[PDB]
Amino acid sequence: SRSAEIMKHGYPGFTNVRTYEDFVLSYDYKTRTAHWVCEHLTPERLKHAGVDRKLCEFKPDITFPKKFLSQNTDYKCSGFDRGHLAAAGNHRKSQLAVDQTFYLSNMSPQVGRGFNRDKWNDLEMHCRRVAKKMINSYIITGPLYLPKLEGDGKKYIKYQVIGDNNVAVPTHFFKVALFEVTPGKFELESYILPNAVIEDTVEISKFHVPLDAVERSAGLEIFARLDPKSIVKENGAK
């Protein structure tokens, strides 16, 4: 199966899991967005087939209960884009595959100018470009709701919710990418970027974090089924 081929190195969690044609998603009934999504790219899979992104329509995934759905109206005039976790550009092999990347379960409220349309997209483009020199590539993407130290010396998680459905606006997003460079051996790259305007001059390497930090902040077990010795490079090191 295509799902087992994607989820080969572990499910980060097993909450409300949905297997689409070309990616896997875990949906959070509370935040009205994803816990995480997982993708598998090969250089062959990054080659386009009469497939058209202009045909795609933002809509909910109605396999989830009605009361836990985000709707296009939650995102209208909110100040945020509907930002795709599993990117459209990664799924080019059928119309339905890419159509599904426009399901609102794969959307999180994202700052547009300076993030989604810019620095975040850069990180997506980086992964595809790197996926081209590798045998297999696996990417986990998802929202974070990170605590901050405030004035009174205590820590608070604060995040906006938008719309009547109260879809959560993540403070940050993570992205873990696992690239198979030679059979059995992998490069690992972990990122946490703020859901905020980032100046086009900042390089993505600056948002490098350990994989341990993503796991703790996200409440997720990432690439749990991969032997750590098979990793020959974490964030550009070793």
Shortest distance, position 65 Cβ to a second copy, whole Å: 7
- Number of C-beta neighbours around residue 158 at 10 A: 10
Residue 38 touches which of Mg ion, a second copy, none (Cβ within 5-8 Å per kind): none
Binding mask 49-88 for a second copy (x = CB under 8 A): ----------------x-xx--------------------
Q: Which CB atom, from 51 or from 161, has the smaller least distance to a second copy?
A: 161
Cα–Cα separations (whole angstroms), residue 137 to 116, 143, 158: 22, 20, 34
Query: Is-catalytic flag, 84?
Result: yes
Do 217 and 146 contact (CB within 8 A), yes or no? yes
Question: Is 116 near Mg ion (CB under 5 A)?
Answer: yes
Region near Mg ion per CB under 5 A, out of 115-123, 133-141, 189-197, 210-218: 115-123
Question: Is 170 near Mg ion (CB under 5 A)?
Answer: no
Which member of 9, 35, 84, 172 is catalytic? 84
Q: Which of 47, 129, 147, 197 binds a second copy (CB under 8 A)?
A: 147
Question: Is 175 near Mg ion (CB under 5 A)?
Answer: no
Shortest distance, position 124 Cβ to a second copy, whole Å: 25
Shortest distance, position 12 Cβ to a second copy, whole Å: 10
Question: Is 7 near a second copy (CB under 8 A)?
Answer: no
Question: Is 13 near a second copy (CB under 8 A)?
Answer: yes
Question: Is 209 near a second copy (CB under 8 A)?
Answer: no
Can you tell me the distance from the alpha carbon of 109 to that of 81, in angstroms, rounded to the nearest whole number? 6
Is 121 marked as binding a ligand? no
Can you tell me the distance from the alpha carbon of 228 to that of 68, in angstroms, rounded to the nearest whole number? 37
Q: Which pair of tokens denotes residue 210?
A: 């350990």
Q: Which CB atom, from 83 or from 142, has the smaller least distance to Mg ion?
A: 83
Contacts for 51-59: CB closer than 8 Å, 24+ residues apart: 51/92, 51/93, 51/94, 51/95, 51/98, 52/95, 53/88, 53/98, 55/95, 55/99, 56/88, 56/98, 56/99, 56/101, 56/102, 57/99, 57/102, 58/82, 58/102, 58/104, 58/107, 59/102, 59/103, 59/104
Sheet with 231-234, edge to edge strand ranges:
17-19, 24-28, 33-41, 136-144, 172-182, 185-194, 231-234
Region near Mg ion per CB under 5 A, out of 19-27, 84-92, 155-163, 227-235: 84-92
Q: What is the DSSP string of 18-41?
A: EE-SS-EEEEETTTTEEEEEEEEE
Binding positions for Mg ion, rule: CB under 5 A:
83-84, 116
The contact set with a second copy (CB under 8 A) reads 13-15, 28-31, 65, 67-68, 145, 147, 154-162, 166, 168, 212, 215-216, 218-221
Q: Enumerate the active-site residues.
A: 84
